[PDB]
Amino acid sequence: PMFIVNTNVPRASVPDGFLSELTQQLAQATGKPPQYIAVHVVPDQLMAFGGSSEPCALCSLHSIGKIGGAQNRSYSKLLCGLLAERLRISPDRVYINYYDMNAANVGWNNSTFA
Amino acid sequence: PMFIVNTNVPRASVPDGFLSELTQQLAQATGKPPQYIAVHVVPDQLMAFGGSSEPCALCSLHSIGKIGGAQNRSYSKLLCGLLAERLRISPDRVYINYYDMNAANVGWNNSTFA
Amino acid sequence: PMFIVNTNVPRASVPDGFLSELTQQLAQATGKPPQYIAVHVVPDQLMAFGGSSEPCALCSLHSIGKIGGAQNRSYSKLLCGLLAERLRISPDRVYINYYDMNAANVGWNNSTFA
Ligand SMILES: CN(Cc1cnc2nc(N)nc(N)c2n1)c1ccc(C(=O)N[C@H](CCC(=O)O)C(=O)O)cc1
Structure with missing residues (x-):
């Protein structure tokens, strides 16, 4: 799996170990082993949610x-949960798009998984 | 709705009001209240369009x-217009991918919209 | 066609000409004229792949x-090859999402391609 977060929160507000924690928790939640989980955190972004510039993702x-x-639902609870606690972002200022890939x-x- | 612009235009040429303007114009165009609209602008990107590094999005x-x-078709007009006036990007150097999310x-x- | 690469490799490791090469290679590989090809390279990213922050994409x-x-498969061979050769990224630390856009x-x- 591949999880990407874009947020207006500063780089310095991302705690040491957050990528490790996302990796491990997405492994648990997803049933896939850690080695297949890729994580991407894009802080300092120029963004708005509902026309407000409060912390968002x-x-x-x-x-x-x-x-x-x-x-x-279950993933959104986990991820909103982590974004609130680790990054201080209100769950109602998060969108998460889910994509089931073939x-x-x-x-x-050098190949595909087909 | 959610709108993301990636561009090689520098951060200093992104007007301070661009996210709000987008937010408001997208609310009208989509019929959705401004609260539902999230906007993300990513400047200073290393991009080429048609092999040229002229401004693009x-x-x-x-x-x-x-x-x-x-x-x-309608949104492309709106958004090419905003990008042309606000970021000085030629509308022929703009791709927009549209996604109809379930x-x-x-x-x-903490949940989904379902 | 549009190709984006997100990587933890530093900006200074991207060779001059990488964007041109990608454009050239994507044109030949897709049979689409280069003028219709856009490429986007995002270095210095905060990423992990399988828990490790070794080079990935x-x-x-x-x-x-x-x-x-x-x-x-053919695109994966081409592109991982290019990521291996130019950015020093191991092929097994690359994921590529393919999207057949309507x-x-x-x-x-100011319109769509339909
Ligand atoms: C057969 N499965 C999933 C799967 C299901 N049940 C399991 N059960 C157990 N006990 N162990 C497993 N390793 C396991 N794996 C798989 C098919 C493809 C990929 C894969 O390696 N990578 C992609 C990368 C996705 C992307 O980047 O878009 C993925 O699974 O999302 C993994 C597992």
Whole structure:
């Protein structure tokens, strides 16, 4: 899986270990081993949510399978949870887009997963 | 809805009001209240379009509904106009990817919209 | 077609000409004229892949058609090769998302491609 966070929060507000924590928790939540989890944190961004410049985030989780109704609520609870506690971002100022990828449409190691 | 602009235009040429202006014009164009609109502007990017490094933009509009053949043609006018006037980008150097998101695939406030 | 690379490799390791080369290679590989090809390189990113912050990359290729089982393998070979050769990134620390865009969902110059 691939998790990306874009936020207006400063670089200096990202705690040491946040990428490690996201990796480990997305492994648990997703059922996929840690070695397949990629994480990307883009702080200091020029953004607004509802016309306000308070702390916010635009995020995406891409995964081959492991994407659906209940799973996505469950991921949003986890991720909103972490964004609140670690980055101090209100859960109502987060969007997370979920993408179920076909294996044939993910390249890796000179090939695809199809 | 969510709107993202990636551009090689420098940070200093992004007007201070650009995120609000986007926010407001997107609310009108989509029919959704401004509160639902998130906007992200990423300047100083290392980009080329058609092999030239003249000013350009790669953008995305994600929304739950309000995406279609007719609406997308319309949004391109609006957004090429804003980018042309505010960032001095030629409209032929602008791509915009449109995504019609399922409610179950959009996380927000510890849950999803489903 | 549109190709984006997000990497933790530093800005100073991106060779001069990398954007041109990508453009050239994507044109030949897709059979689309170079004028329709946009490339975007984002270095210095805060990323982890499998828990490790060794060199890695997360990438997207968006294109109207020219996306499929075999074409995507061939693109992966080409692009991981280029990421291995120019950015010193190991192929198994690269993910590439392929998206077959409907023409009506790509805005360009005040309209769509539908
Ligand atoms: C068969 N599966 C998933 C899967 C399901 N159940 C499991 N159960 C167990 N006990 N262990 C596993 N390793 C496991 N893996 C897989 C198919 C492809 C990929 C994969 O290696 N990578 C992509 C990368 C996605 C992206 O970047 O877009 C992914 O799974 O999301 C992994 C697992």
